[PDB]
Design a binder for this molecule. Structure first.
Ligand code: ZN
Lengths: 116, 225, 333, 421, 50
RNA sequence: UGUACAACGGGGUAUUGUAAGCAGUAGAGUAGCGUUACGCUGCUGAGAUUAAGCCUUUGUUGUCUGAUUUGU
RNA sequence: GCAGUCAAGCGGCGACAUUGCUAUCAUACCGAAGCAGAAUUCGGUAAGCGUCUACUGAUGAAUGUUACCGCAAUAGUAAUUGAACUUAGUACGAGAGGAACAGUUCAUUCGGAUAAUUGGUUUUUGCGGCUGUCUGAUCAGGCAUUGCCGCGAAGCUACCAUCCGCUGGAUUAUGGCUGAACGCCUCUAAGUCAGAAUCCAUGCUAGAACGCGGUGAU
RNA sequence: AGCGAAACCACAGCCAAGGGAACGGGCUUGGCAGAAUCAGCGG
């Protein structure tokens, strides 16, 4: 199984949920929830709304692009399998998540500046 | 030398299999006869592993490559990417192609020295083929055919192309591709020769329904003897 | 349509009565013929198809899976049966002198107003030095050829808002009925683990009263080939962590089950849907036969279970994933 | 149809066909009626019964007629061939008689239906139906001889080795039991012998063979010495697009001496010369040399056991009919001996192993040790492939600890820097 | 739409001879698995799979 | 008269798409004589929905006998 | 129907044959065809499935009382067709051609249910904006016995979504053994093997509301 | 909540067969099945 990304919410989506549409252009389009699919059918861009991940992360309301968010990305070439190398993924992903946990809070606090 | 077989009694060998000089790709299922046919002549000197591509049985049309490397379609799941590297030795490169149409058996058809690509193929993989495959790349719609890869098969011994190829074109391809070709038909006169045949420098596989003259012509052009 | 389920008359009791049972086992020891539980709900399962000759061999397959709550069954008595021209007859019955409150309450409808002075004359007699009690066991052993064991659900462990339990008579097939009665007595007041009754890939069948469409439904039903995917334990953390994904989580959907409490006890996953609905008792049996076929011989390859919330839509599987992706909010730091 | 017939429906004898039609009309149609029922209902009942019987008879007759091929319009060669196997005039007369009987049955059924539409009494309708059925049976019953002849013709024609005249064919002619009987068997698969009696080959055997990747076939003449068999053989040799060959024997086979054989051979002069004749022979020299007067022929002495001579003659006949950069290979693959199914020590294919153990496709696919992995100690995998809502495949890379080391200190850098003010 | 074994839905008159060959050499369109896989002959005559 | 019935608050849960207010002076605005009819910023994935048939319960608190017939 | 070699009886008629036009369509244990093989039709068997009375949902005291559990006489009863893998490119067959039993893989058909996703489903009377109504007005959308744009779980709910849908005997026709009758013969009259999709057993449904049994309470 | 009719009523209903013009509903041979009591297939 492979987790894909929705073009509307720009977030991962599990299989067997929402609705999936494939255009004649020979590529797949996914939607986490039926509301996203309906909005995409109406051509309503969410990237200008305060709630969507794309707007929040880029503007400052949420964590922006950072070195931590540079590993969960698809790759074009395969990797040689190794049982020992599997353990590295478990530790590496956990450490990356722990590192990121200390950056989202910092970004939110920076956004909160001036609330005093 | 040449072998006649079928997958599910279907003559579309080129759709359910993709045989190369360094690896063998065939469909999957309980019917091991198709895999056994390749295993017999090929034996064990080269890896013979049946695997799925994008979950479909059209692995033959879905994948393409040569001795230097292997190419797989865009829809190839990341799970199959691990299998691709595990089965093939590290000496053979593996690269995924982001084609417009998810079928390498239609966009790319090549051999150990020359490759034919769709006119609208991505420039990235088009240039990378010169290293992954080590072959020359030419955008050429044979006789105007949009599906270049599904109507021809190529190898260092030559190949069989759709009947629309003129004899003069076949003779010129002896120098344009460094290997002469022959115009013929497979699957009892089917114009789509590449769909029903898979053949390499030392082994040829064709549909059972293929007529004897077609098999003899295929053997002669590939100079097996 | 089908006249076998007509008239459309409601069943007599919510609990589904079990009619048939296997015949006998000449060599194997005493074993439980059936198991019972409660329907926790339904979710989704994805695995890899190892079934031979399949068109989707080694390809992902998705199908609905029901989750059944199966708390450790406890034995509280044994019933002896004797063959008669009129059929099986329960000539004698015996208890264990330590019936739980869950069972004693079932013997009342106004437990609050009841004096609760039940199982006293017999329990006091049972408290004697065996001699009197052993006579019934000897009589059962002398004549009886089929023995049934009374069992009830540990409702206290389940999150249901019910204290009264239910008594179900479960048959045994082990030979030398003396061994059967000896085993039953040795297990009085004891519990039996779920794994000891059923195992993975077993082609068990279940019977339960269907949902009442309201007089449509509410009748007893049966369906064979209710294959169990994976048996889980409440104490064994990471039950929802499949063999492949092994994600640290539990099968309980986020925010609990729809109109049902969170699952925190032993549970079993069964392929496909099942009769009844949430908050309904169900029974499990081995279909009385063996479905010899490659469908049964295959093995489970579970990869992921749908554990998203059922209130509205769902974007996350576990709370640990939500906070990372969603980040903080007004109600947080 | 083509020049081959094996789908002709069986010709039911008049009695058998009549019984079948009677059973069909009795069973399918209703059989319970009373005088107290509606008069219109009884009229409809009788009309339906009569119409069903007539339609069944007509359909059976049409099906019988359509199955048989039209001898006249099939082909002149096949027409002449059938003219000797069966009496062509009798065949046409029988077909015409059957067609006329079918037309008469149709007319009778239509007339009875028209008359029955205005019946006045139930017994009148019953009598009309009885008369119609009796007339149909009587007309059908008289077809016993033509129906028997049609059945015999169908049986005889259902197995003939007929072939298209345009196909390359070889014709062998000669006296009975000359020795050419073994010729066809050697050239093509057939069951014939050189038993020392004249007509060891009564039928016109046909057999296929291949040469120079081109299809060919040969035909053996039953015997030529008017004779019915001789006429039938001639009416196929003359019209077939084939090469006619002659055979001879000295004193043992064929009975007749060389002079008689030469005299018989000269009798086929008017028409045999146009088919590139050749002669094989199983004071006498002059008689044999007399064949040279033909515009072109080849004569060679041989024997029934001279298989190489037969092969050379076949090759010569086929020739006469016809006249009218360097690759790169993984040498390791080709070094291994080619597959030898008969060798018990060969590299048994997965098919054989599965059949021995896994049986048919019921076996399950496995990839144990299939991967070209370095260490076999860990040839078993349970891939996580998903963790914390993220795909493990995006993190599985060789020794990512080196990259993680550069990010480890970023936590301390952020903590002491104080982004949280 | 229709359910796929992969775990996600999918959605977007012609006749052929008994061999499934269409009257064209440059067929194009939404040739899903229902035709790209069911009809291997058509899949070779069709470029845009899925 | 007890890991007992219960009521809110809170959390879990997703949903809508960013509430009323300070007040745009973040910003060109321009009819005058920079002004003023008027020209998405901090709370704010915000407010609310968030079971009269979604889950809980770190739980304090409000509660706990009104009638009945039958018995080898 | 007309005339007749027509002739068992028989008061001059007369069933018998011949001479002139005019309770299955597939689902097959079984046999025949000039059935090499597939296919085919015929006699074969079965209607199994294909092609004011009546309750369809219901209530009430019973057999010391109460509560639990259990047996079953009874009535009903259900799965199913096609396509591929395979023995298969085979037995066979002059060549082209193209079977099956044993095990698997898919969908329509009929039935029992589940909501894992989606929707025809919305009174969360739920939400951001919005119109008539027009709000002292920036507050406020104060109103459409039921509002619009964008959404919505749940109740509902269907391949418009999902899972599932039996294993042993007795027999009809039929193929044999022994064995006569009728010193022979034979399948049958004594018995018996194989064998029906038929019948009964297996299972499921409800359970005599006066069919029954066991247990805690006085 | 309370008031309050009418049509119709020799008496009226568990079925299969015989019952002559067949009307079977009260004659004969057999099989059914609960005092009391909601609600109806599109009869
Ligand atoms: Zn999203």
């Amino acid at each position: 199984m492979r987790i894909y990304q929705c073009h509307f919410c720009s977030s991962p989506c599990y299989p067997g949920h929402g609705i999936m549409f494939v255009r004649n252009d020979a590529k797949e389009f996914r939607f986490c929830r039926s509301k996203c699919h309906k909005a995409f059918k109406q051509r309503r861009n969410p990237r200008k709304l305060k709630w969507t991940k794309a707007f929040r992360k880029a503007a400052g309301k949420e964590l922006a692009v950072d070195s931590t968010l540079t590993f969960a990305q698809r790759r074009n070439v395969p990797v040689r399998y190794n049982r020992e190398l599997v353990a590295t993924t478990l530790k590496a992903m956990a450490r990356i998540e722990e590192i990121r946990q200390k950056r989202e809070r910092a970004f939110y606090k920076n956004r909160m500046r001036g609330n005093k | 030398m040449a072998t006649r077989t079928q997958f599910e009694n279907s003559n579309e060998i080129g759709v359910f299999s993709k045989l190369t000089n360094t690896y063998c790709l065939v469909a999957v299922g309980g019917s091991e006869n198709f895999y056994s046919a390749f295993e017999a002549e090929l034996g064990d000197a080269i890896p013979i592993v049946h695997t799925t591509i994008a979950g479909t049985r059209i692995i033959g049309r879905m994948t393409a490559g040569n001795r230097r490397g292997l190419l797989v379609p865009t829809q190839t799941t990341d799970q199959e990417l691990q299998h691709l590297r595990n089965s093939l030795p590290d000496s053979v490169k593996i690269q995924r192609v982001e084609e417009r149409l998810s079928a390498l058996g239609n966009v790319i058809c090549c051999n150990d020295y020359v490759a034919l690509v769709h006119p609208d193929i991505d420039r990235e993989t088009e240039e990378l083929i010169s290293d992954v495959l080590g072959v020359e790349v030419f955008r050429q719609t044979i006789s105007g055919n949009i599906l270049v890869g599904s109507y021809c098969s190529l190898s260092n011994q030559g190949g069989l192309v759709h009947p629309q190829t003129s004899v003069q074109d076949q003779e010129e391809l002896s120098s344009l591709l460094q290997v002469p070709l022959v115009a013929g038909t497979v699957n009892r006169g089917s114009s789509v020769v590449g769909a029903g045949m898979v053949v390499n420098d030392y082994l040829a596989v064709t549909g059972l329904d293929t007529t004897a003259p077609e098999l003899s012509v295929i053997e002669s052009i590939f100079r097996l003897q | 349509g089908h006249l076998g389920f007509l008239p459309r008359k409601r069943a007599a009791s919510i609990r589904a009565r079990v009619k048939a049972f296997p015949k006998d086992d000449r060599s194997k020891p005493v074993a439980l013929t059936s198991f019972l539980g409660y329907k926790a709900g339904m979710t989704t399962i994805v695995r890899d198809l190892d079934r031979p000759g399949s068109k989707f061999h080694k390809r992902e397959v998705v199908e609905a899976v029901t989750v059944v709550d199966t708390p450790p069954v406890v034995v509280v008595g044994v019933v002896g049966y004797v063959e008669t021209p009129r059929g099986l007859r329960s000539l004698t019955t015996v208890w264990a002198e330590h019936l739980s409150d869950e069972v004693k309450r079932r013997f009342y409808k106004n437990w609050y107003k009841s004096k609760k002075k039940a199982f006293t004359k017999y329990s006091a007699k049972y408290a004697q030095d065996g001699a009197g009690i052993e006579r019934e066991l000897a009589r059962i052993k002398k004549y009886a050829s089929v023995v049934r064991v009374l069992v009830h659900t540990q409702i206290r462990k389940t999150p249901l808002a019910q204290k009264k339990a239910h008594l179900a008579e479960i048959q045994l097939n082990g030979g030398s009925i003396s061994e059967k009665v000896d085993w039953a007595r040795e297990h009085f007041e004891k519990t039996v683990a779920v794994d000891s009754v059923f195992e993975q890939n077993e082609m068990i069948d279940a019977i339960a009263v269907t949902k009442g469409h309201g007089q449509r439904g509410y009748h007893s039903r049966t369906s064979i080939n209710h294959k169990i995917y994976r048996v889980g334990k409440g104490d064994d953390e990471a039950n929802g962590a499949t063999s492949f994904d092994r994600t640290k989580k539990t099968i309980t959907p986020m925010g609990g089950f729809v109109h049902y409490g969170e699952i925190k006890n032993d549970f079993i996953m069964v392929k496909g849907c099942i009769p009844g609905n949430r908050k309904r008792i169900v029974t499990l049996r081995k279909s009385l036969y063996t479905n010899t076929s490659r469908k049964a011989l295959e093995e489970v390859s579970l990869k992921w279970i749908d554990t998203a919330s059922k209130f509205g839509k769902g974007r996350f599987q576990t709370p640990a994933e939500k906070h990372a992706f969603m980040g903080t909010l007004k109600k947080d730091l | 149809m083509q020049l081959s017939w094996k789908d002709i429906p069986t010709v039911a004898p008049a009695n058998d066909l009549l019984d079948i039609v009677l059973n069909r009309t009795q069973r399918k149609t209703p059989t319970v009626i009373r005088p107290g029922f509606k008069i219109t209902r009884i009229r409809a009942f009788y009309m339906r019964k009569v119409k069903y019987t007539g339609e069944g008879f007509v359909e059976k007759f049409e099906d019988i007629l359509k199955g048989f091929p039209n001898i006249n319009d099939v082909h002149p060669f096949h027409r002449d061939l059938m003219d000797t196997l069966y009496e062509k005039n009798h065949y046409k007369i029988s077909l015409a008689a059957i067609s006329r009987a079918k037309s008469l049955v149709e007319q009778v059924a239509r007339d009875y239906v028209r008359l029955l539409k205005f019946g006045q009494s139930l017994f009148q309708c019953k009598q009309l139906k009885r008369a119609a059925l009796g007339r149909m049976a009587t007309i059908v019953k008289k077809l016993r001889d033509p129906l028997a002849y049609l059945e015999q013709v169908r049986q005889h024609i259902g197995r003939l080795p007929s072939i298209d005249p345009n196909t390359r064919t070889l014709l062998i002619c000669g006296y009975p039991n000359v020795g050419k009987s073994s010729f066809l068997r050697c050239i093509t698969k057939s069951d014939v012998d050189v038993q020392p009696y004249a007509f060891t080959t009564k039928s016109l055997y046909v057999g296929h063979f291949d040469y120079k990747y081109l299809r060919f076939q040969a035909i053996d003449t039953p015997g030529i010495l008017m004779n019915n068999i001789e006429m039938q053989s001639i009416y196929a040799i003359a019209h077939l697009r084939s090469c006619v060959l002659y055979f001879m024997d000295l004193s043992e086979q064929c009975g007749f001496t060389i002079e008689a054989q030469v005299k018989l051979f000269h009798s086929i002069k008017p028409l045999f010369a146009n088919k590139s004749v050749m002669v094989v022979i199983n004071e006498r020299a002059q008689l044999l040399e007399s064949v040279k007067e033909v515009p072109g022929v080849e004569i060679m002495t041989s024997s029934c056991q001279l298989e190489e001579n037969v092969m050379e003659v076949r090759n010569k006949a086929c020739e006469k009919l016809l006249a009218s950069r360097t690759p790169f290979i993984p040498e390791s693959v080709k070094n291994l001996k080619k597959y030898d199914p008969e060798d018990p020590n060969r590299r048994k294919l997965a098919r054989d192993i599965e059949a021995e153990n896994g049986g048919a496709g019921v076996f399950n696919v496995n990839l144990k040790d299939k991967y070209l992995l370095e260490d076999d100690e860990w040839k078993n995998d349970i891939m996580p492939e998903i963790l914390d809502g993220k795909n493990v495949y995006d993190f599985l890379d060789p020794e990512i600890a080196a990259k993680l080391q550069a990010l480890e200190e970023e936590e301390e850098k952020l903590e002491n820097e104080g982004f949280y003010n | 739409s229709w359910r796929r074994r992969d775990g996600v839905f999918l959605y977007f008159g012609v006749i052929a001879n008994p061999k499934g060959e269409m009257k064209g050499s440059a067929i194009t369109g939404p040739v899903g698995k229902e035709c790209a896989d069911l009809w291997p002959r058509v899949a070779s005559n069709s470029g845009v799979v899925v």
